[PDB]
Amino acid sequence: PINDLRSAIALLQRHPGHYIETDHPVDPNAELAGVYRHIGAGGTVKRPTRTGPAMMFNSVKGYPGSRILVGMHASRERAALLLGCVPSKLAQHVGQAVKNPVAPVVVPASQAPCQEQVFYADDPDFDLRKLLPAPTNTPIDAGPFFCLGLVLASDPEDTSLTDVTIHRLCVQERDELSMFLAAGRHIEVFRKKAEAAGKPLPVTINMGLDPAIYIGACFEAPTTPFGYNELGVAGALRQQPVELVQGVAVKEKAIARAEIIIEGELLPGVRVREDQHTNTGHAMPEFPGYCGEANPSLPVIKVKAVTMRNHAILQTLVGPGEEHTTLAGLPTEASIRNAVEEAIPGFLQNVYAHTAGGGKFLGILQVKKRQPSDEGRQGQAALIALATYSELKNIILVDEDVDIFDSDDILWAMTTRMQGDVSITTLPGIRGHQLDPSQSPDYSTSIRGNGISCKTIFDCTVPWALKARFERAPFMEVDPTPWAPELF
Amino acid sequence: PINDLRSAIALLQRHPGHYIETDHPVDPNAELAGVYRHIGAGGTVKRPTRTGPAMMFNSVKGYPGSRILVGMHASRERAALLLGCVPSKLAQHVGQAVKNPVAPVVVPASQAPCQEQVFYADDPDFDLRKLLPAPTNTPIDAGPFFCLGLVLASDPEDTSLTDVTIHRLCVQERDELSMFLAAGRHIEVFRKKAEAAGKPLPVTINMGLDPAIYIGACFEAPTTPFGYNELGVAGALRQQPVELVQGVAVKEKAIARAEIIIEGELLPGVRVREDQHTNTGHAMPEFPGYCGEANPSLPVIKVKAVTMRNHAILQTLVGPGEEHTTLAGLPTEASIRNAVEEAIPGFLQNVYAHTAGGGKFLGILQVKKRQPSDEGRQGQAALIALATYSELKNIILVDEDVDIFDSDDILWAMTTRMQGDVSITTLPGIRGHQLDPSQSPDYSTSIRGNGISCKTIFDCTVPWALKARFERAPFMEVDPTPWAPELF
Numbered sequence A, B: 001p002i003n004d005l006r007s008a009i010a011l012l013q014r015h016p017g018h019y020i021e022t023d024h025p026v027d028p029n030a031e032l033a034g035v036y037r038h039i040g041a042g043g044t045v046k047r048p049t050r051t052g053p054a055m056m057f058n059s060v061k062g063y064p065g066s067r068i069l070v071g072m073h074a075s076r077e078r079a080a081l082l083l084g085c086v087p088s089k090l091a092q093h094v095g096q097a098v099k100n101p102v103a104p105v106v107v108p109a110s111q112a113p114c115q116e117q118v119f120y121a122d123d124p125d126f127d128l129r130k131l132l133p134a135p136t137n138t139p140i141d142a143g144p145f146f147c148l149g150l151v152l153a154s155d156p157e158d159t160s161l162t163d164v165t166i167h168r169l170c171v172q173e174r175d176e177l178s179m180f181l182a183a184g185r186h187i188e189v190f191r192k193k194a195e196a197a198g199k200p201l202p203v204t205i206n207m208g209l210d211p212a213i214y215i216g217a218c219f220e221a222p223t224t225p226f227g228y229n230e231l232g233v234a235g236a237l238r239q240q241p242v243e244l245v246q247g248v249a250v251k252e253k254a255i256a257r258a259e260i261i262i263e264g265e266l267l268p269g270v271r272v273r274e275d276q277h278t279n280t281g282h283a284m285p286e287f288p289g290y291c292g293e294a295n296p297s298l299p300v301i302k303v304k305a306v307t308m309r310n311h312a313i314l315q316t317l318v319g320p321g322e323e324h325t326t327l328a329g330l331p332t333e334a335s336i337r338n339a340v341e342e343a344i345p346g347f348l349q350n351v352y353a354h355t356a357g358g359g360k361f362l363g364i365l366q367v368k369k370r371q372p373s374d375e376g377r378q379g380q381a382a383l384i385a386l387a388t389y390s391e392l393k394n395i396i397l398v399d400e401d402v403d404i405f406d407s408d409d410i411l412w413a414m415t416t417r418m419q420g421d422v423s424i425t426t427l428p429g430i431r432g433h434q435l436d437p438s439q440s441p442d443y444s445t446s447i448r449g450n451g452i453s454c455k456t457i458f459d460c461t462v463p464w465a466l467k468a469r470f471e472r473a474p475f476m477e478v479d480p481t482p483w484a485p486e487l488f
Ligand SMILES: Cc1cc2c3c(c1C)C(C)(C)CC=[N+]3c1c([nH]c(=O)[nH]c1=O)N2C[C@H](O)[C@H](O)[C@H](O)COP(=O)(O)O
Pocket: A146, A147, A148, A149, A163, A164, A165, A166, A167, A168, A169, A180, A181, A182, A184, A185, A186, A187, A217, A218, A219, A220, A221, A320, A324, A327, A328
């Protein structure tokens, strides 16, 4: 029974290949991410790279007693194990959880291991940059980063409305972090409201969590509208409410069984340049695989306290690579699957938020045409996907005999089940995502501004009338195990 | 306080222009529809036609004491009057209704005006064809029709789940009607379960109702999925549970305040050709404005009793014209508005399921670009509309300074705010609707079968960067009343 990060690690150690440790000292500045690039980053990371074990660095140069874990979610197979289902059924499993959330509950401090140690920021010797290692991804990052900082915040007009979101946080001072909030983010709604009143917004930053919590948090509207506390998704995944705890220094709740907690306040009026201390002009790598530019004006979090377990693990990521694919892609699949199943019951067999799009840009939809009237519904399913997840860019439609998690098999369907002047539909001028650098007026005259795209639907499903001609060569059903037991 | 059809009529008489009566004899065979075609049929009806008053024919040739009402819903303004809001806010008023239904409530027979007269079909002289004047729309109809028959059935395995749907009913014998159910209709799921067990399914047909009941019943999935009693959308429009009565001859409930009830059972194994007595080859006019073909195999309702008020009004429609536009269009609008508001809050201003598409084929979306990032979201709204209502064919996008209910102003936006090689996106091969005769491989080589279409998005919104050049010419704001008092 997993209810925190260390019960999750215990599970991975029962499945060898999924978790390793090392005691060889590593520099959290750039070197750590450089090592894991070769070992488990995966995703859109610059080659050479691969998926591998989640990796724990026990010896962190400059931070004795600290230990850093990366890659916990950097594998679809690892994610399915931690959630307790088969990887091919994640879309259905996560889809049902978001439809039936279990609300979190408050517990006293006695059942909050996150509060075994309390460090107040008003101590003259407190220094966030000395207390926790904040690893960087590239040598040209804006500064030390926390990349799995699950921020928890509430509406200042109604404290029953809580939202939880991962945002990148750069360590700027002994007691300040910069926080990037994209436009339209739900916590940003809370922040703009507090700043409009000239008041700070209390926040907790929760790091080192049950993988169900990180995954469950990464939903967006309309699947989780404004007001939907995404912690309910984790509660449904575990059939156990997430436990919240009162922070020690801010008027906001914290995740009781987290490893590390930073309590702080979003200051009104204050803005800071993300790379003020390095002037690299860059923030950190983004999920499409390119380096993001430093943000010139970010709100800052004034740290009030840091609150940890004993021998606490600092969990972060590298790439963000395959870890981002899992965190964003599983909700993307769940959101799409729920929408298509509601509109066209029984039609959609599966969906893959492909790692080549970081779990956001590329959707592979697996459909099964059961009757003549299903012809023409494959394009409807693509439209539903595009309408459900506006940050999608391209859709590839395939039949139930194509393995959507095998990119070779996807390209096969694009080769023998596609005619370029028949099967490709382009939709110009649709708002997409700022971090796709090809979504620029410089790339296409049909793009009026940054983050607008042509979106393309590749229909690689066999036309209904031709299905008897496109049967894949049938090989005899055998159990191969007796001829090579070692390989099974 | 409107609880039924007579109270609804009473309100219309307080608004001159919306209700008229005639004592000049009329033949319910073809001639009645021929007259109302000129008076208020509207919609896709072949010109000359118009919207006008709801019309009560008090002298029905061959049926003394009967009186036929048509056109009750054949006007958006009249529907707005009957529901108590302004016509521009029906999309929002009905949208909030479907998302807050109020379940119906059972009532004893002493409070059921529908049962003031009872005619059991086991009487030797009972003849449905002499008892009620079921009018025909065209001389080539399959036979006499009831076109506002709200059929009420339930799951034979779960009595708790009840569905209500308008279906065209053709009087075939003295105690029999045929009923057409399209593929995947929700009541068809109940009948197929009944027929597969060799059991009849008891049903009640409710005619002459509060307009709120007819309108709220015409929703479709995924807005009102399978298992959603459409009764209660009416309950939300009236803030009043509609009242039910236990049937006098079948194990099913009827709407207590209806004008006429027909109690019957869908018979297992039996099928009839819809035009068996006419051999015209046609059923009746469909909502796109063409003649539907006679269905060769339809289930049969065996009438067990007919139950009606004193001086019962037979309510039906003609065209189906604008009456269908209202019944189908306002659920269409509510569904699209709810979906876009969930996905892009504040962006969509209004939506019109245009009468030229019968309330189903043509969607006019009125958006307001508020900021640079709203450029590219107009196409996203169009995708959401097409994903939400799969029977849509075309989308026209316009700004908030275009009156989407004025077809001249729509064509204006298509003339000065569109370039043909920029603003038009075509999506070939998407399933649409069988009753669009242009959705045929004979019309286009990209159409693989009947009811598949190219779907087209006309972006007639001003590009964000150009909005200052497209301001409509402003006139001094005056009160014109003193210069033309009689014109109000
Ligand atoms: C998984 C993930 C999501 C990040 C993210 C990261 C990851 C790993 C980082 C740490 C690698 C770097 C950037 N992140 C940010 C972010 N959203 C945002 O506004 N600012 C961010 O800095 N997101 C996206 C955000 O978490 C998702 O879009 C949420 O679904 C938004 O939820 P909301 O609707 O509640 O606001």
